[PDB]
Design a protein around this ligand. Structure first.
Ligand SMILES: [Mg+2]
Ligand SMILES: [Mg+2]
Ligand SMILES: [Mg+2]
Ligand SMILES: [Mg+2]
Length: 438
DNA sequence: GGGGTGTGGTAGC
DNA sequence: ATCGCTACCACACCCC
């Protein structure tokens, strides 16, 4: 047990946090792409007609944690048992659940306690531990396989378990559903072999948004090919409103209020107007959804194809610790802030940059919220506060940055015992060149 | 037209 | 027990 005032807290928390792993893995994949392409020009031009293959592991952590499970779980059956990956037994996040579990309504992000109640009696939840190194090794085999196939002009990392793969079609060549199905089946088989038993699903289309939707329709362990020319009511009626990229719970609530609770993308596209859309969820998001309901990408989403090097380039650097934060005095808070700045500057030096603007954000216990929340060591119900500061000169100096971060904490006025979370941010990064004379 | 700030939401497991 | 990260767009609202 490592408490937050222990010097090892940051190391231990990040070693156990799957959300930290997800972000660190994604950051590393983007840096790797930039390094491998520093002298290449595989970007998509206006002259290119392309097919998108959106490829994603099915129930990634659950599949891999199963395939690598310890001898204690040897009898576990991936096809018949409801399986989750999680740390705990009660108010612990289900990071991933297999499709047996999902047949009872269990979802990624659910607490174990909530998921257990959806099982009929006699049906036992199997909880597997995280296998983080294995997750990374399987993802390595995934990206290795995608490259080795020599069928994509551009391979964009989305996450540890997901990539957007672009195939350029010469007008020389007549593309067909038959060829696309064969490519999907090749990819699915080669990844199944290369990962020793993991399955991917694939969405294949001529836009990013349709490929994402096709991917959802393909799961589990399948593929779907839906081009703009194949769109139909049957397609749109198959999707929930929050199946649309960019539509989470808050946008969903607004759409349901404005449009009389649509229950499918078909309902929505028959009811909406562009203007009512923009009024409900905002102008840019409204335009994105409007175009999406046409099967079309918006300008912002297309930038990753036209200029992947710019989109994938890191523009900020931060840490967030909103779990296990229980400090008794300002001395201990300040030491934790110093430890966090040390960690961030190590990352900042690895990428050979300085920073010209920093932010501290905190979570503070709501005045009427219990001191110990339902989730062990959780932040609970909180109010958020943030404050930023522009540095005079771009710098990587601990003394300057840590001192200003601690000043920023002081100006937010949160008593140490009320603190439930801290984020430390370098908002603007500046290159370091060969000329540092003045 | 340019700039700034803090806040909100989403994305992957 | 339990590990509720983190990058980045978009917004509302302020200044010249
Ligand atoms: Mg998915
Ligand atoms: Mg997946
Ligand atoms: Mg994924
Ligand atoms: Mg969505």
């Amino acid at each position: 047990i490592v408490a937050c005032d222990d010097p090892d807290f940051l190391t231990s928390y990040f070693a156990h946090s799957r959300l930290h792993h997800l972000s660190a893995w994604k950051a590393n994949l983007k840096d790797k792409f930039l390094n491998e392409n520093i002298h290449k020009y595989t970007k998509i031009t206006d002259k290119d007609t392309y097919i998108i293959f959106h490829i994603d592991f099915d129930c990634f952590f659950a599949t891999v944690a199963y395939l690598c499970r310890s001898s204690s779980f040897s009898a576990c059956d991936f096809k018949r048992d409801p399986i989750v990956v999680c740390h705990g037994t009660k108010n612990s996040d289900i990071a991933s659940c297999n499709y047996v579990a999902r047949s009872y309504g269990i979802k990624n992000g659910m607490w174990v306690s909530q998921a257990e109640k959806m099982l009929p009696n006699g049906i036992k939840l199997i909880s597997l531990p995280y296998t983080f190194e294995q997750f990374q090794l399987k993802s390595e085999a995934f990206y290795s396989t995608l490259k080795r196939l020599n069928i994509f002009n551009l391979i964009l990392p989305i996450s540890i378990d997901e990539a957007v793969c672009v195939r350029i079609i010469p007008d020389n060549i007549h593309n067909t559903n038959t060829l696309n199905a064969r490519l999907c089946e090749e990819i699915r088989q080669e990844i199944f072999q290369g990962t020793n038993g993991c399955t991917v699903s694939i969405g294949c289309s001529d836009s990013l948004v349709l490929a994402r939707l096709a991917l959802k329709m393909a799961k589990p362990n399948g593929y779907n090919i839906t081009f703009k020319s194949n769109l139909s009511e049957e397609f749109w009626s198959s999707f929930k409103l929050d199946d649309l990229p960019g539509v989470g719970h808050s946008t969903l609530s607004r759409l349901e209020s404005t449009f009389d609770s649509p229950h499918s993308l078909n309902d929505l596209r028959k009811r909406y107007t562009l203007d009512a859309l923009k009024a409900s969820v905002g102008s840019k998001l409204g335009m994105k959804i409007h175009l999406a309901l046409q099967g079309q990408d918006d300008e912002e989403s297309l930038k990753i194809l036209y200029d992947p090097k710019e989109v994938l380039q890191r523009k900020s650097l931060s840490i967030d610790i909103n779990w296990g934060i229980r400090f008794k005095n300002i001395t201990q808070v300040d030491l934790f802030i110093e430890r966090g700045c040390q960690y961030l500057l190590e990352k900042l030096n690895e990428i050979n940059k300085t920073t010209s603007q920093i932010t501290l954000k905190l979570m503070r216990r709501c005045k009427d919220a219990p001191i110990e929340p339902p989730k062990y060591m959780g932040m609970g119900r909180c109010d958020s506060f943030s404050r930023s500061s522009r540095l005079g000169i771009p710098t990587n100096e601990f003394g300057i940055i840590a001192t200003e971060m601690k000043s920023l904490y002081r100006t937010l006025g949160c008593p140490p015992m009320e603190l439930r979370g801290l984020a430390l941010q370098f908002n603007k990064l500046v290159d370091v060149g060969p000329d540092n004379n003045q």
